[PDB]
Amino acid sequence: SYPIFTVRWVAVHTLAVPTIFFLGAIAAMQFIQR
Amino acid sequence: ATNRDQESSGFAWWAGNARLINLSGKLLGAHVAHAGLIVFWAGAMTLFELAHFIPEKPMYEQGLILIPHIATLGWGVGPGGEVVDTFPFFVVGVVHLISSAVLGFGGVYHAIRGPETLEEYSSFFGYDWKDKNKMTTILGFHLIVLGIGALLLVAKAMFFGGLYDTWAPGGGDVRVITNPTLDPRVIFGYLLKSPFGGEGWIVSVNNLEDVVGGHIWIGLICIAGGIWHILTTPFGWARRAFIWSGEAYLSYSLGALSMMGFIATCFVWFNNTVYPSEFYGPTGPEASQAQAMTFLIRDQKLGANVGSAQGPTGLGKYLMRSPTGEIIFGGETMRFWDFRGPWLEPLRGPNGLDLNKIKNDIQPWQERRAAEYMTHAPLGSLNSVGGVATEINSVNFVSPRSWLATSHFVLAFFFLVGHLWHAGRARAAAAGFEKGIDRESEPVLSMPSLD
Amino acid sequence: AELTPEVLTVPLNSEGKTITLTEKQYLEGKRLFQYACASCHVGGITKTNPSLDLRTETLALATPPRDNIEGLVDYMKNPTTYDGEQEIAEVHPSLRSADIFPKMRNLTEKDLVAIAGHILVEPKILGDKWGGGKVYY
Amino acid sequence: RGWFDILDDWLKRDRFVFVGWSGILLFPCAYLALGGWLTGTTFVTSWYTHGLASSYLEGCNFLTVAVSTPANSMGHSLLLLWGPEAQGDFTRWCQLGGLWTFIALHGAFGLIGFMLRQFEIARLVGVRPYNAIAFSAPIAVFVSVFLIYPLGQSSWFFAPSFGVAAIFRFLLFFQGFHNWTLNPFHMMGVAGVLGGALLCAIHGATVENTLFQDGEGASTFRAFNPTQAEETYSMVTANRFWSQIFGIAFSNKRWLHFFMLFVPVTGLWMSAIGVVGLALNLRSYDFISQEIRAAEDPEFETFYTKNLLLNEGIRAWMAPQDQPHENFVFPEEVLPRGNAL
Amino acid sequence: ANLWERFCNWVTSTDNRLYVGWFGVIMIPTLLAATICFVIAFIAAPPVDIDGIREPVSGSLLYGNNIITGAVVPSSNAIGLHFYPIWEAASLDEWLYNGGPYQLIIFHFLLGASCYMGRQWELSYRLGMRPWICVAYSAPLASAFAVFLIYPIGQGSFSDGMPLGISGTFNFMIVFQAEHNILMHPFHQLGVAGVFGGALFCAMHGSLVTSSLIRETTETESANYGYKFGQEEETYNIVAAHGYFGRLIFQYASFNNSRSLHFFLAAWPVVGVWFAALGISTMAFNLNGFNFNHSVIDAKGNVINTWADIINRANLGMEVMHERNAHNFPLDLA
Amino acid sequence: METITYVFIFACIIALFFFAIFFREPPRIT
Amino acid sequence: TTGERPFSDIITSVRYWVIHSITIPALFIAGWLFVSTGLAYDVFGTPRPDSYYAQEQRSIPLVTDRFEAKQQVETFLEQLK
Ligand code: CLA
Ligand code: CLA
Ligand code: CLA
Ligand code: CLA
Ligand code: CLA
Ligand code: CLA
Ligand SMILES: CCCCCCCCCCCCCCCC(=O)OC[C@H](COP(=O)(O)OC[C@@H](O)CO)OC(=O)CCCCCCCCCCCCCCC
Ligand SMILES: CC1=C(/C=C/C(C)=C/C=C/C(C)=C/C=C/C=C(C)/C=C/C=C(C)/C=C/C2=C(C)CCCC2(C)C)C(C)(C)CCC1
Ligand SMILES: CC1=C(/C=C/C(C)=C/C=C/C(C)=C/C=C/C=C(C)/C=C/C=C(C)/C=C/C2=C(C)CCCC2(C)C)C(C)(C)CCC1
Ligand SMILES: CC1=C(/C=C/C(C)=C/C=C/C(C)=C/C=C/C=C(C)/C=C/C=C(C)/C=C/C2=C(C)CCCC2(C)C)C(C)(C)CCC1
Ligand code: OEX
Ligand SMILES: [Cl-]
Ligand SMILES: [Cl-]
Ligand SMILES: [Fe+2]
């Protein structure tokens, strides 16, 4: 009854998709040694 | 559920412990379960501290705060504060940790399973906050418990091994206290001592005979006032002075705790008697005095006449006079000339630091102590980089005195805020306007204008 | 830049035989230097006597020379003043004064070599920073 | 009802995040500014422009990461990705500090989009546009600090780098080089910020402590209804309290709330003007009459002459690493120091 | 009614133009003493050997200073934390040389300002208000205790307290950063978020209310005349303001409860400034800001500088230059 | 003249405080 | 109230979490691999811990020419081999 893709959906995913990508990247960085 | 939502209780979820003000059974359980949290932490921290503990490192290098509290009691330490046995730290941790499962049980029991109110079940364990005689009775019960606790410290010091004594002659050692200071001109004399520099109020207590005899006096005073409050009701001058409600009594304890936390902050910062520097590290004043001692010793070994060496300002580079004329260490550490410690007091004559003693009688143990204390000054970063803010990463050190003083400043400040919050609220609640101004009888509207 | 063998190759004696430390040896030496020595010797200086640092050229002019592994190991056993004239174990941490300097008690010869290697490798890494003080921070 | 009016219909639909015509400018420019900052602080170095590590990938934490400014040899170059410095190479563009100008320009046009959004929504809902007017103060601060300040200087290098410690360095640079605390425009900014924080605290506490009892709960938030015509707190009681505590008190709620606009907005605008002067090195650095007296009287000392000695320390100790394009070799004997330290 | 009852009725009287009260019987003489001694010492005090090194700093207007450079100078480092009233000095000339006025002013002021806080509770009690305005004032009061009393206690000397002057304030700040790296301390950062946030929310609440004022006036008059003192209706449309601000961001980021809004206006600056006060008060015991000097190291061991190392270079320059004659030994330990 | 100037302005501010508190336009409930 | 589905209804539904217990760990693992494979260094030009300096270099490779800056970095990178 509600739609699924709105402007709000886009606004959420433009933030959340890169955020989860960056958090995975920053987590991997904690294991680098010099 | 009785009183477990905002409609029935009047309090939102974020003020939800205020729903327990008039539910003495659940309120008892909150306190017993919280007592179990304190005892849990005391046990769990000690076992953590012991599991991380290196006996060949000093305690102050190892981020320990509870092991030094046990060591000062005389347990597990030998001459100079070296650890002769780690088993007393293990006992103190284990016994607290086991006992918190006991306090946790009765806390959880009274808070979820027992009766919500104790008044029907028992007149002795029930109370009205407004019953002033019941309030002084429980106050008397807890005063007796605290006075016996103060005599437990006396019993440790006199009859059960002693206490660590940093001023014990020939170096610090656990010492049985045989003649505690019972003279009330000395004991209550600290209460009238100014809090300012050179005096320092009760923080200046510099010998275990004063510490033990004070706890004799405190233990007997708390037992006397305990028995006094069980056998009396508040006089009329006190009834017309105070607010008689649970939130009000909370606020009085909040102001009392805030005052005590500020006192303990100054105790750990300045006092090297009940917080020995072998366990807690040098004080702030101690390390600055120890740097001046280090560079006097080194330069006098090079051939300098340290009594006659002029600094850049014309004050003595090593030695100068205090404003009352005592011979003191020069440089910025002129502010710390009230410092007294066992490594320094041998050099001090009747008029201050003795130049003949300084030339001849500085032992190698004093030189080792001065260099160790200068390099373990209570300065460091929040990530525990030792030394000044400009120091590079290498040394992992923040002194326990800094951790204990800063934590207890924060706690004492917020407890003062809590005192103000609850004392203002208890007054407004007793006078009846804590929920706001009645529109149909607004007080300012019947006052004359200011102009 | 990497911590190569050439960086990790320091003099062992006064004659001129070298020892190439392992990265495990250098990293263990840095840990033990921080544990036992950096409270006075952080960054290669000396907090309680700034006249004498831990620079390689300074240890070379010490008597006996301390600019090799065995010279530093002997100093950690029996430390002297800069001319070698006095024995300063009663005020300086060493194996022979581990009863008054208790962090020196459980130091092995492998530990003393590792600390000595850290003292020699570190100025090859840091340059004038090692032994320079706040000017080079 | 042509295509424009149909497009205007869709842009102004009541949705979860309002778009509007301003959203065409605001949303991509703000997202690239934010996304550019998060990208640079996670992955991009400052090794070639400053000689600094500045990303999480290099080992920095949240306090030490920054999108750093370009090298001083870039000048005031726009550092477009297709411009003559990067020549289209994204990797080289990142290494040249092209992300800094990316963030500063998208951030600038994003802020323009935000004030347009404030104007657009205020016009559509029918309210007065004072929120857009108050937002001119953060716009004046961003424009003066991140644009006008480096444009007056040698290059974008001396603008703030987008990062926590990088901003702290900028504060310390302005002390040591500009003596920015001595500047009356900064002082007016400090009074506006601390006055606005005072006004925020004092107004919120006064309302919350002069509330009318409009319900039976001890938690008093429920006793407000969003559609009530009546005041929720007593202006008369608030006025009498402050008149007796402090001597003066507000008696006009409209003037009170205007003054809450005015104070931090005027303060930030005043601080922007002082930075515009510092773009040209037009500092309030010295007091000439104190310098004449101190130079001839070596016993004359104030806190002002003490602060200048600190300023001289800051410059000589920080300049070789803070300005590595100058190739400053200050030998240790030239360094100003006090005794012992 | 006897004289004491008549006196107590006057002291706590709600009809006095300025409320006296019991906190006021302490607040009034102490603040008057602190103010009078401040104005005199700011105008006319002789120079003060603040650092205990026989190097007196001129603070007063008559001795060279202007409004910006003038200060009442903190008491001598030779005094330390010693209580130095006038009667401890052998003469007024000695008291003035050693920075006597500073101790008199700050002790009277902190006593009086504490009683100002109690007076704020007291009047709210007399007026039937809720009592927590004084909790909001505890934020600046704690800050004043932090810089005038708590920081001297930890450092061992009132010579280290904040001077009573504009340039002396800046001297206190720069030296504090040199020794404590306060910018890198999270309690000062929370403090900054408090005052920046407080200024933001002040401008936000001011603009939103001004934006939603109900039309009651013509074009040729100030809109403030649309509000009458003591009127019962609210003077702005909170539903329109929520409708604006809930569309500027999104609906659930905007307050529709004015009580929740005004509590947030109280709570944000106060908690932040509380944290700023605890910043100073715990840096008083030398628990300093974050030290990341030489934290980033390459594969060989080369220090890779960060912005934190650049901060350190500035801190070193402040450190080596401050109190340039006062240090004889290589560590500044207090 | 500088010291006179600064004290003069200060004294005028303190005088202004007096008139702003004791001779304010009286807030009137209407 | 603007027509979209409430966030409490979405994140509590099973169909959201069937989709997102794959998408959320996949994006996290993709970010992890962007670092762990070393691609982030190549895309952004950020030095690895062994590529800030040449082996006996103490000097920082600072860009000094505006229009030859791309060539200077490349030269600085060829100096690392
Ligand atoms: C020291 C912390 C502490 C303690 C001891 C309490 C205690 C209590 N709270 Mg309070 N509260 C707290 C913090 C605390 N609170 C905080 C931080 C908040 C904000 C979130 C609240 C908000 C709040 C509200 C809104 C309410 C309470 C209520 C209560 C009372 C009844 C709780 C209940 O109904 O359980 C029901 C919940 C359970 C039965 C679930 C599990 C809880 C158990 C006790 C967990 C025990 C776990 C432990 C590991 C077991 C060890 C056992 C072992 C020793 C053998 C109880 C006395 C209620 C009250 O006042 O009643 C009139 C109430 O309405 N609290
Ligand atoms: C009196 C309280 C107190 C004090 C002085 C210490 C001191 C210490 N702890 Mg201990 N500890 C405590 C309580 C305390 N702790 C508590 C409650 C716990 C359970 C979490 C622990 C568990 C613990 C562990 C597991 C360890 C320590 C360690 C340490 C040492 C290093 C600390 C550090 O790096 O902090 C890091 C600094 C922070 C985390 C920042 C603290 C800032 C606080 C949270 C601000 C609080 C303000 C306010 C109350 C909160 C806001 C409320 C406001 C809105 C009203 C230091 C000796 C370490 C150690 O060296 O062991 C040998 C260690 O490993 N502690
Ligand atoms: C402040 C603490 C406190 C208080 C005032 C109460 C009070 C009460 N409890 Mg609770 N309870 C507590 C803690 C407390 N309890 C703890 C820690 C536990 C876990 C063991 C319990 C488990 C518990 C259960 C299962 C029950 C109660 C019950 C009761 C009620 C009757 C008990 C009685 O009269 O026995 C008479 C008392 C004695 C014969 C002497 C007490 C014996 C103890 C061991 C002496 C300890 C004193 C010593 C100083 C403490 C050492 C540790 C200390 C250092 C902290 C009374 C309301 C009953 C109830 O709910 O009634 C409806 C009930 O069924 N309690
Ligand atoms: C936690 C401990 C505690 C608590 C909460 C109470 C609480 C109470 N006591 Mg009790 N009392 C106690 C311990 C305690 N007492 C002990 C241990 C003893 C034996 C010494 C007594 C002996 C005692 C007597 C003889 C009386 C009370 C009375 C009272 C009631 C009113 C007291 C009052 O107005 O204080 C506030 C104090 C004043 C208004 C007096 C002025 C105090 C000055 C202004 C403060 C100076 C302190 C300042 C901070 C400086 C500190 C350092 C200083 C030494 C230099 C109150 C219920 C009274 C009562 O009602 O009896 C039934 C009463 O007559 N108590
Ligand atoms: C012994 C101390 C004590 C006790 C028994 C009480 C008891 C009470 N307080 Mg009081 N209060 C205290 C100290 C105390 N307070 C202090 C020190 C302060 C100053 C901060 C306050 C400020 C205060 C306010 C402003 C209010 C109360 C309220 C209340 C009532 C409800 C509490 C509740 O449900 O909160 C539930 C618990 C929470 C919502 C959580 C609090 C979390 C804090 C803010 C942060 C803690 C951070 C932690 C230290 C570190 C971080 C760890 C984290 C990451 C996990 C209850 C009667 C309420 C009231 O007045 O009712 C009449 C109320 O509005 N208190
Ligand atoms: C409203 C959205 C918006 C705005 C205002 C900006 C603005 C900017 N961007 Mg950003 N950008 C955006 C969205 C936006 N961008 C989006 C969605 C992306 C992802 C694709 C980017 C990705 C991006 C990158 C990678 C870069 C920029 C850059 C810039 C700056 C320079 C742009 C420029 O000079 O082009 C000029 C183009 C115009 C002004 C369009 C002219 C339109 C006219 C009126 C019509 C005539 C055109 C004509 C017919 C073309 C014929 C060609 C023929 C003659 C050969 C400028 C601040 C640069 C930068 O940040 O510098 C550091 C840069 O490197 N942007
Ligand atoms: C409820 C009132 C409380 C007072 C609110 C004031 C303090 C609010 C604190 C800040 C917000 C905290 C989160 C609210 C907490 C809260 O109250 O939640 C309630 C709110 C709505 O919940 P539901 O969606 O379940 O409810 C919808 C209703 O219709 C119920 O049927 O949740 C959110 O809005 C989720 C936020 C996701 C955010 C998505 C954002 C997408 C990007 C948009 C950014 C663009 C706008 C920028 C313009 C330039
Ligand atoms: C009411 C309430 C609450 C609270 C709760 C509480 C607070 C409780 C407590 C609890 C507790 C307080 C508990 C405790 C427990 C403990 C235990 C369980 C213990 C154990 C022990 C052991 C078993 C040990 C062991 C060991 C040994 C012996 C040796 C060494 C090793 C070890 C350690 C392993 C809350 C908030 C949630 C909310 C709701 C209501
Ligand atoms: C142990 C010891 C000791 C001892 C000690 C002692 C002896 C103590 C005591 C103490 C005490 C003995 C205390 C007291 C306190 C008090 C208080 C703290 C009070 C307060 C009060 C108040 C708070 C009140 C209030 C009020 C007012 C003011 C007005 C009216 C109303 C009212 C009532 C509210 C010594 C040092 C030797 C050494 C070490 C150890
Ligand atoms: C630049 C550029 C660009 C763009 C890009 C972008 C747009 C990106 C985005 C990105 C992003 C968008 C990212 C994100 C990130 C995120 C993150 C990194 C997060 C983190 C988080 C966290 C860590 C959290 C924390 C916290 C807080 C904050 C508060 C509360 C508490 C907590 C703790 C939770 C392009 C290609 C167009 C072009 C070229 C250039
Ligand atoms: O006084 Mn005023 O500032 Ca506190 O650190 Mn030590 O002392 Mn002197 O030097 Mn840095
Ligand atoms: Cl200075
Ligand atoms: Cl010194
Ligand atoms: Fe308002």
Alpha-carbon gap, residue B248 to E274, rounded angstroms = 24
Neighbours of B14 (CB within 10 A): 9
Residue having the nearest C-alpha atom to atom 8 of ligand 11: E323
Neighbours of B62 (CB within 10 A): 17
Structure tokens at E203: 């401008």
Structure tokens at B321: 């006079």
* Contact yes or no, F with G (3+ CB pairs under 8 Å): no
* E120 annotated as ligand-binding: yes
Check if the beta carbon of residue C52 is closer than 8 Å to that of residue C71.
no
What residues pair up with B349 in beta bridges, in sequence order? B352
Residue having the nearest C-alpha atom to atom 17 of ligand 8: B101
Three-state DSSP at B319 gives: strand
Alpha-carbon gap, residue C92 to C82, rounded angstroms = 13
Is beta strand B380-381 parallel, antiparallel or unpaired with respect to C9-11?
A: unpaired
Its sign, for the CA torsion B232, B237, B242, B243, is: positive
Write the CA distances from C39 to B50, C33, D120, D341, E72, integer angstroms: 23, 9, 63, 18, 40
* Contact yes or no, C with F (3+ CB pairs under 8 Å): no
Ligand nearest to the CA of B332: 13
Task: Provide the phi-psi class of B201: left if phi over 0, else alpha when psi is between -120 and 50, else beta.
Answer: left
Its sign, for the CA torsion D229, D232, D237, D238, is: negative
* Domains of chain G with CATH codes: 7-79 (1.20.5.860)
Helix (H) or strand (E) holding B175: strand B173-175
The residue type of E40 is I
**DSSP per-residue letters across C28-93:** HHHHHHHHHTHHHHGGG--TT-TTS---HHHHHTSSS--SSHHHHHHHHHS-B-TTS-SB-TTTS-
Dihedrals phi, psi of C107, to nearest 5 degrees? -105, 125
Alpha-carbon gap, residue E147 to E162, rounded angstroms = 6
The residue type of D8 is D
Ligand 7 centroid to D258 CA: how many Å?
28
* Contact yes or no, D with E (3+ CB pairs under 8 Å): yes
* E251 annotated as ligand-binding: no
Structure tokens at E329: 């030994």
Alpha-carbon gap, residue E238 to B420, rounded angstroms = 32
Structure tokens at A18: 């890169």
Is beta strand B352-353 parallel, antiparallel or unpaired with respect to B348-349?
A: antiparallel
Can you state the angle between helices C109-126 and C23-36, rounded to 10 degrees?
Answer: 100
Residue with tokens 């905007």: E254
Of C39, C43, C106, the CB nearest to B376: C39
Check if the beta carbon of residue E313 is closer than 8 Å to that of residue D318.
yes
Alpha-carbon gap, residue E149 to D287, rounded angstroms = 31
Measure in Å the smallest separation between the Cα of B147 and chain E Cα atoms.
Answer: 31
Dihedrals phi, psi of B321, to nearest 5 degrees? -105, 140
Radius of gyration of chain B, Cα coordinates, nearest whole angstrom: 27
Of B32, B119, B144, which is best to mutate to test ligand 3, by the most ligand atoms within 8 angstroms of its C-beta? Answer: B32
Measure in Å the smallest separation between the Cα of B47 and chain E Cα atoms.
Answer: 25
Long-range Cβ contact pairs of A5-12 (< 8 A, separation 24 or more) = A6/D15, A6/D16, A6/G3, A6/G4, A7/D15, A7/D16, A7/D17, A7/D19, A8/D15, A8/D16, A8/D17, A8/G4, A9/G4, A11/D16, A11/D17
Of D15, D49, D91, the CB nearest to G63: D49
Instruction: Give the best residue of E115, E291, E293 to mutate against chain B (max B CB count within 10 A).
Output: E291
Is beta strand B380-381 parallel, antiparallel or unpaired with respect to E287-288?
A: parallel
- D213 to B15: CB separation less than 8 angstroms, yes or no: no
Return the closest-CA partner of residue E306 out of C42, D47, D39, A30: D47
**DSSP per-residue letters across E164-228:** EEHHHHHHHHHHHHHHH-GGG-HHHHHHHHHHHHHHHHHHHHHHHHHHTB---S-TTS-GGGGS-
Map D106-174 to HEC letters.
Answer: HHHHHHHHHHHHHHHHHHHHCCCCHHHHHCHHHHHHHHHHHHHHHHHCCCHHHCCCEEHHHHHHHHHHH
Dihedrals phi, psi of E288, to nearest 5 degrees? -95, 180
Alpha-carbon gap, residue B222 to B395, rounded angstroms = 46
Task: Provide the phi-psi class of E227: left if phi over 0, else alpha when psi is between -120 and 50, else beta.
Answer: beta
**DSSP per-residue letters across E258-322:** HHHHHHHHHHHHHHHHHHHHHHHHHHTTTEES---TT--B-SS--B---HHHHHHHHHHHHHHHT
User: How was it solved?
Assistant: cryo-EM
Three-state DSSP at B385 gives: strand
Alpha-carbon gap, residue E315 to E276, rounded angstroms = 20
**DSSP per-residue letters across E92-139:** HHHHHHTTHHHHHHHHHHHHHHHHHHHHHHHHHHHTT--STHHHHHHH
Return the closest-CA partner of residue G72 out of D153, E306, D53, D71: D71
Check if the beta carbon of residue B393 is closer than 8 Å to that of residue B387.
no
Residues of F in contact with D249 (CB under 8 A): 27
Residue having the nearest C-alpha atom to atom 32 of ligand 6: D80
Label residues D29-45 b or e (16+ Cβ within 10 Å = b): bbbbbebbbebbbbbbb
Residue with tokens 């501010």: F13
Check if the beta carbon of residue C115 is closer than 8 Å to that of residue C10.
no
**What resolution, expressed in A, was reported for this entry?**
2.1
What residues pair up with C18 in beta bridges, in sequence order? C11
Residues of E in contact with G59 (CB under 8 A): none
Give the side-chain half-sphere CA count within 13 A for D12.
14
Ligand nearest to the CA of D107: 6
Alpha-carbon gap, residue D46 to D59, rounded angstroms = 13
Alpha-carbon gap, residue B265 to E307, rounded angstroms = 34
Q: What is the dihedral of CA D158, D159, D164, D165, to 10 degrees?
A: 10
Structure tokens at E284: 């008083």
Check if the beta carbon of residue C66 is closer than 8 Å to that of residue C59.
yes
Residues in chain B: 451
Dihedrals phi, psi of B380, to nearest 5 degrees? 180, 175
Measure in Å the smallest separation between the Cα of D289 and chain F Cα atoms.
Answer: 11
Ligand 12 centroid to E170 CA: how many Å?
10
Alpha-carbon gap, residue C124 to D31, rounded angstroms = 46
Alpha-carbon gap, residue C76 to C95, rounded angstroms = 6
Q: Where are the domains of chain B?
A: 1-281+378-451, 282-377
B vs E: CB pairs below 8 A: 227
Ligand 2 centroid to D62 CA: how many Å?
21
Contacts of C58 (CB under 8 A, 6+ apart): C52, C131
Label residues E128-152 b or e (16+ Cβ within 10 Å = b): bbbbbbbbbbbbbbbbbbbbbbbbb
Check if the beta carbon of residue D25 is closer than 8 Å to that of residue D31.
no
Ligand 8 centroid to B26 CA: how many Å?
19
Ligand 12 centroid to E310 CA: how many Å?
21
**DSSP per-residue letters across B60-111:** GGTT-SSHHHHHHTTTTB-GGG-BS-SHHHHHHHHHHHHHHHHHHHHHHIII
Check if the beta carbon of residue E18 is closer than 8 Å to that of residue D244.
yes
Contacts of D215 (CB under 8 A, 6+ apart): B435, D222, D223
Alpha-carbon gap, residue C88 to C79, rounded angstroms = 6
